[PDB]
Design a protein around this ligand. Structure first.
Ligand SMILES: CCOc1ccc(-c2nnc([C@H]3C[C@H](NC(=O)c4ccnc5cccnc45)C3)n2-c2ccccc2F)nc1
Ligand SMILES: [Zn+2]
Length: 206
């Protein structure tokens, strides 16, 4: 029972999500090996995802977390990348499909940097790239990120199967022998809602 509402490029709501995606782009340690080489996207479509079932199951979990974190949800708008976006918008985030070899264990990963989420769109480390050209830096094939409402609650700072005791999420941090950029991880699908579905291409520089 999911409905996509196509947003006009002249919508302030569109422009807000567009601005956030473009501005949160960073240079990457791997020289774009995983995500491709770019400093800007081609923003084709931004659609608002609408599902009462998935929305109600989010708000319900958000309430519980607030009561366990001094009446503060710790709600953040964050980008999500994965090969499973089409499923997520229909059946919601599902921890049961989490990759156990992840750096912070079997969780659903988010980022405050759109360019980081991009790296995971065609699998872990961009996998074998786009299906058509088998190219991680493909400027041709259309990509999809989710821009999600995420309840982080009491987030454990680090650098596993569920959140540490007393906590509701993990915030990964830049270590000289570790991460360059921030990660955010939940171990429960109901703690995130995919509010916006963004269709885009990475754009060739020069
Ligand atoms: C160092 C980088 O390591 C990472 C980065 C991101 C993630 C991650 N975060 N979230 C995901 C996906 C797997 C979750 N799947 C669903 O929520 C889901 C929901 C509904 N239906 C599905 C059907 C098939 C697969 N997944 C689903 C979301 N993934 C994910 C899981 C497996 C493979 C690639 C991924 F991006 N895991 C590890
Ligand atoms: Zn391609």
């Amino acid at each position: 029972g999911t409905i996509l509402i196509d947003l006009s490029p002249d919508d302030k709501e569109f422009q807000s999500v567009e601005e956030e995606m473009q501005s949160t782009v960073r240079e990457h340690r791997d020289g774009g090996h995983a995500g491709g080489i770019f400093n800007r996207y081609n923003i084709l479509k931004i659609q608002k995802v609408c599902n009462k079932k998935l929305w109600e199951r989010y708000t319900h979990r958000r309430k519980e977390v607030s009561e366990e974190n001094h009446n503060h949800a710790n709600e953040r708008m964050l980008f999500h990348g994965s090969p499973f976006v089409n499923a997520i918008i229909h059946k919601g985030f599902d921890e049961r499909h989490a990759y156990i070899g992840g750096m912070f264990g079997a969780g659903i990963y988010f980022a405050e940097n759109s360019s980081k989420s991009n790296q995971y769109v065609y699998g872990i480390g961009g996998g074998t790239g786009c299906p058509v050209h088998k190219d991680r830096s493909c400027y041709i094939c259309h990509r999809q990120l989710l821009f999600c409402r995420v309840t982080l609650g009491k987030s454990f700072l680090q650098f596993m199967a569920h959140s540490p005791p007393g906590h509701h999420s993990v915030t990964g941090r830049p270590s000289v022998n570790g991460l360059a950029l921030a990660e955010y991880v939940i171990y429960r699908g109901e703690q995130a809602y995919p509010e916006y579905l963004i269709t885009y291409q990475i754009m060739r520089p020069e």
